[PDB]
Design an enzyme around this catalytic site. Structure first.
Site, PDB file in Angstrom:
ATOM      1  CG  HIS B  30    -113.460  98.378 -14.202  1.00  0.00           C
ATOM      2  ND1 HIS B  30    -112.083  98.388 -14.256  1.00  0.00           N
ATOM      3  CD2 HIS B  30    -113.810  97.151 -13.748  1.00  0.00           C
ATOM      4  CE1 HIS B  30    -111.620  97.219 -13.853  1.00  0.00           C
ATOM      5  NE2 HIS B  30    -112.647  96.449 -13.541  1.00  0.00           N
ATOM      6  CG  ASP B  52    -110.683 100.833 -16.222  1.00  0.00           C
ATOM      7  OD1 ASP B  52    -110.982  99.657 -16.521  1.00  0.00           O
ATOM      8  OD2 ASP B  52    -111.158 101.415 -15.226  1.00  0.00           O
ATOM      9  CB  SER B 104    -110.663  94.436 -11.493  1.00  0.00           C
ATOM     10  OG  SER B 104    -111.097  93.984 -12.762  1.00  0.00           O
TER      11      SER B 104
END
Lengths: 48, 153, 153
Positions: B30, B52, B104
Site C-alpha cells: 500500500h 499487502d 508502515s
C-alpha cells in the site's frame, strides 16, 4: 431425397465422440482449476 | 534497526520502511515510493497482494548481515523504534498517540536482536492503539492479524 | 588437526587436504594431486562424483588413531585452522578474507575435538564468506550445504 438432413443426427458418433472429448477436456480443465482455487483458499483459511 | 532499515521516498518524503530478513527484502504494497538504496531499486519484487506486501531476493553482499528471524512469541514487552510494544492476548498494542502514517513496514525487534513482526497499520481504541501487523506461527504460517477498524499507515 | 590432516601435492604445490574420519579416508574430487603419505597411496579410492568426493578403507594399524565425526551441532562457533567458523540457521560462514584456494577438505573442529563438517569451497559475500561444505545429520545422513554462488576451492 425423401428425408430432410438435420444438424443433430447428421454427424457420426466417431466425430461426435472426438468433438465431445475435445470440448470436455477444456470443461474438465476449467472446473478442476476452479476447485483447485477453492481448495487452496479453504486450506489457507483453515491453516491461517 | 537504523543501519539495516531503509526509508522510502515519495516525492522526497518518508512514507514507509523496507525490511530485510533472512536474505529476503519485504515492503508493504500500500505504501508507494522508491527505495533510497540504488542497488535495491534493481531488485525484482514479487507481490502477495492479499497480504499487502511485496518480497524479493536480495543481492549477495548484504544477505548475511540481516535481521535474524524467530518464531517464539511469549507475551510481554518487545523492542520498537519508537519504544516498547505490548504483546498480550495474541495482539500487538502501543500507547495511544505514538505512531501513524509513514511508519508502515517498521520492524519490531526482539531483545536478542531478532524480528517478531512487521507493522502495517494501527487502529485507535481510545485507551491504546492495536497494530495491524503480520505475525508468524510455530508451523511457519504468517497470519496477517488486523484488529477491527484497522487502517494501513 | 595437524597430526591427522595430510596435504595433497601437485608439482610441488599444495592444492587440497585429505581427512581420516571414522576409520576411513576421505579426499575431495575437485582437486587433483598426489597424497603425501605412502601407506595410504595404495588404497583404492571409491568415488562419489555427485558428492564431489572419494572414500577409502584405511589399513589396520592407523585405524585406531583417527578423527571422530559428530551428529549433534549446537549453533554458534566451531574451531578451525583459521579461527572460529560461525554456524546458524543451518549454514556455515567465516569472517571475510579468511580461507582460499587449497583449503578444501580441511575439517571443522569443535570443543571436544571431533569433526562437524568438511570444507569444500566458499563464496565471498563482502560482510562474511559463506562456506559450501558437507555435514552430518541426526538420522545418520550426509547432506551438502552449498549456498548460491559457491565456487570450489
Amino acid at each position: 431425397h425423401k428425408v430432410d438432413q438435420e444438424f443433430q443426427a447428421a454427424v457420426s458418433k466417431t466425430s461426435w465422440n472426438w468433438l465431445l472429448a475435445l470440448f470436455g477436456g477444456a470443461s474438465s480443465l476449467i472446473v478442476v482449476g476452479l476447485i483447485v482455487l477453492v481448495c487452496s483458499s479453504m486450506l489457507i483459511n483453515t491453516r491461517r | 534497526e537504523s543501519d539495516k532499515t531503509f526509508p522510502i521516498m515519495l516525492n522526497g518524503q518518508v512514507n514507509g520502511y523496507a525490511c530485510v530478513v533472512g536474505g529476503r527484502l519485504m515492503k508493504p504494497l500500500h505504501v508507494e515510493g522508491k527505495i533510497d538504496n540504488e542497488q535495491l531499486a534493481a531488485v525484482k519484487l514479487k507481490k502477495a497482494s492479499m497480504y499487502d506486501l511485496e518480497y524479493g531476493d536480495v543481492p549477495q553482499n548484504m544477505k548475511s548481515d540481516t535481521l535474524q528471524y524467530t518464531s517464539d512469541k511469549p507475551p510481554g514487552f518487545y523492542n520498537w523504534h519508537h519504544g516498547a510494544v505490548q504483546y498480550e492476548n495474541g495482539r500487538f498494542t502501543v500507547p495511544r498517540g505514538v505512531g501513524g502514517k509513514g511508519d508502515s513496514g517498521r520492524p519490531i525487534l526482539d531483545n536478542r536482536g531478532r524480528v517478531v513482526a512487521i507493522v502495517l497499520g494501527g487502529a485507535n481504541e481510545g485507551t491504546r492503539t492495536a497494530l495491524s501487523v503480520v505475525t508468524w506461527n510455530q508451523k511457519g504460517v504468517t497470519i496477517k492479524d488486523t484488529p477491527e477498524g484497522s487502517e494501513p499507515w
